C-alpha cells in the first residue's frame, strides 16, 4: 500500500464522530455548512466532501472557484458556496458548475447577471455583510439596503442567502460578536421590511456554534471543529467533544552513531555531546514541517524526541536519547498524537493550529483510515 | 486565460538566463545536474525539467520517488536521481521508472538487487558518503569502503555514482567544506585503489559551484541558483548573475474606506487611526503567505504597502496610504519584484529564501511566461 516516506493520515471515523457531536448541539432545522476550504484544512477536500455527502450536510463552503470545481469534477453534488471573492473571469465557470457566489457589490451582481443571462442560467449568490471584521461585504447601511434591493431584482440572479463573519468569537468576550450581530440584524430587519425573501441566513462559525446558541439562524458554518480542533482555548470546550483527524507521519530513513563533537545539518548549529544516536527522517520544510520552528519534536515508539540541527528541505535529524528498539522504516509521528499536536507546533511558531494543518504540502499523500483500515490513498503528484 | 485569483508566475526566460551563466562557469566536460526537488523549489518541476531537457542538462535530482515518477509520467526521459531515502515499498517503482537511487548501506543495496533480479532489470545507484553533515551516507572509513566494494559486485546494481553534500559551503569560511572534501577524497582514492570504477563523482552545490571551482568532479548539482537566488549572502555573488524566476501575484478584490478607530480582521489586532483606504486581497496563509510574518508587505502599482491585521487563511488586508489609481481587480505582487523579495520575507520570518519558495500552496496555479507571453497554465487542482 503506502509507497511514500511521508504522509498524512486521516481518520474518517473521527470526522464522523466530530460532526455527529456537532449535530447534537443543533435543532433539527438548523442547516450545517461544512467548510472545506483549503483542501479541507489540509485533510483533502474531495474525500471529506464525500463523507459529508454521506452524512447529509446541507452546504459546503470553499474559498476559491477551483476548489469547488474540484469537488464537482469528482462528482460532488452538494451545494457549494465560495466564501470569498470571485474574479470576473471565473463567473461563467461558477455558474456552469453551480458554485454559489459571494457578492458585496451591486456592480458585481450586475456583471454576474449579465453572464448568467447570456447562458440562460440563473446564478445563485450569497450577500456578505461587513459586521466589523472589515474584510469583505456590504457596509451595514441604507445604501447597501437599497443596493441589495436592486440586486435582488436582477433576473438571472437568485439571492439565496446573506451572511456575515465574526472577528472575535473564539475569545472570552462576546461583546464584539453581539455587536456584530446587531448590524446583521439591522440588515435583516430592513430587507424583510422591504419584502426581500432571503432563504438562508447565517452568521456562525465554529466558535459561535459552540458558544452562541442564539445565533443559529438558518445555517451554521463549521470548520475547524470538524477536524477535531478547537478555535481557541477560550471556547467552551465541554460543549463539544473532539477527536483530531490527522496525523502527520514518516519513517525512519537512517539511523547511526555519531561521535562526540560532530555537527549536524546545515550551519552545524548542533553538536553531539558524547556519543549520540541519530536518526534521519525524510520529512522537511518543503513538506510543511517548517524550518521556523525552534523546538521541533517527534514521537517515535511513544517517546518524544528532539529534532536536532537545522531542518532541511526534505529531511530532519532526531536524537535518540531514550532507549528503544528502532530501525530504519519505523514510523515517526510529527503531530497528531500524544504530546505532539498541531497546537504544540503552533504555539512554538506563534501561529494557530489552523495554519499548521494547512501547511501540509502537495507531496504528502493523504491516506484515509476507516474502522482502523486503510481505505484510500491519494497522491497529489501521481496519476 | 487566468481564472484564479492568485497565482505564481514563472519566467522561463529567466531560468534560461540563469542556466546559461551557470554553464558559463564550467568546463566542456563537467556535467550539470539540475536539482528540482520539491516541485522545482516550487516553480513546477515538470515544466522546469522540460526546459532543462531542452537545454540539454545531464541529470535531474529529486527528493522523493514520486517526484521522479511524476516527471516520468510527464514524458521526461533524462536520468533522475533521488538524492534521498527510498523505502522498500518504493524500490520496484524506482527500478521500473528509471529512478537512480541513493544508497548508503550495503543492506539496502542487497534488497534493491534482489528486487532488481526479479524484474530482470539492472538497478542504478549512487552511493552517498557522509562527510560531515551527518545526514545520510556512509561513514568515511575503511569498513565502508569494503562494503561499497561488495555492493558494486551485485549483479543488477549498476553503481553509477558517488557523492556527498556540504554543510557550510555557503559560508565565508570554507574550512569545513574542504574538510568534507577530503573525507570524500579518501573514499574515492580507496575505491580507485580497489578498482571500483564509479562513472560520476559529484559533491558541489550551488554554493560550491560558485565559490569552489576546484570541486567540480564529474558533476555539480545546481539548485537554488537555477531559480535565480543565492544560497547565502556570503557567496561570491559577482561570479554569477541571476534573475529570480518566480513572482507571487494576486489581485485586488475589495476596496473601501474605513472609518477611524475600527478594527480589522482576527482579534482586531489592528485599529484604524483616521480614514484609511483598505484593500482586501485574496491570498492568505493557506497559499503559503504565512501568518507568521511580523511585517508583511505588498507592492502595488510600484509602491510598497503594509499588510494590516492578522493574515487569514485565504485573505489579507492592505493599507493604501500613498495615492494611486487602483481598482478592484488590479494586480498585487507578494514577492518576486522590486522591493518585495523572498529574501525579505525570509529575513522577517527568520528563515531562508529556500523555504519561502517552497511554501507556495497547491492551489496557487503556476503560470508560465516566455517572451513576455503566457504560454502555459497549470492547475494542481483541476482537470
Numbering used by the authors:
A (entry chain B), B (entry chain A): 3 to 385
Give me lines lifted from the publication on this model.
Alanine racemase (Alr) is a pyridoxal-5′-phosphate (PLP)-dependent enzyme that catalyzes the reversible racemization of l- and d-alanine. The structures are prototypical Alr homodimers with two active sites in which the cofactor PLP and cycloserine are localized.
The third structure is that of the K271T mutant enzyme in complex with PLP (CdAlrK271T). To prevent this cleavage, the lysine at position 271 was mutated to a threonine: K271T. The structure of CdAlrK271T is the most complete structure and each monomer has ordered main-chain and side-chain electron-density maps for 383 of 385 amino acids with the two disordered residues are at the N-terminus. The topology of CdAlrK271T was chosen to describe the overall enzyme topology since it is the most complete structure. The secondary structure of each monomer is approximately 25% strands, 26% α-helices, 5% 310-helices and 44% loop and turns. CdAlrK271T had a significantly higher catalytic activity than CdAlrWT. Kinetic analyses reveal that the K271T mutant CdAlr has the highest catalytic constants reported to date for any Alr. Lys271 lies on a loop in the substrate entryway of the active site and it has previously been shown that mutations in this region affect the activity of EcAlr. Accordingly, the high catalytic activity of CdAlrK271T could arise from the formation of a tight dimer that hardly dissociates.
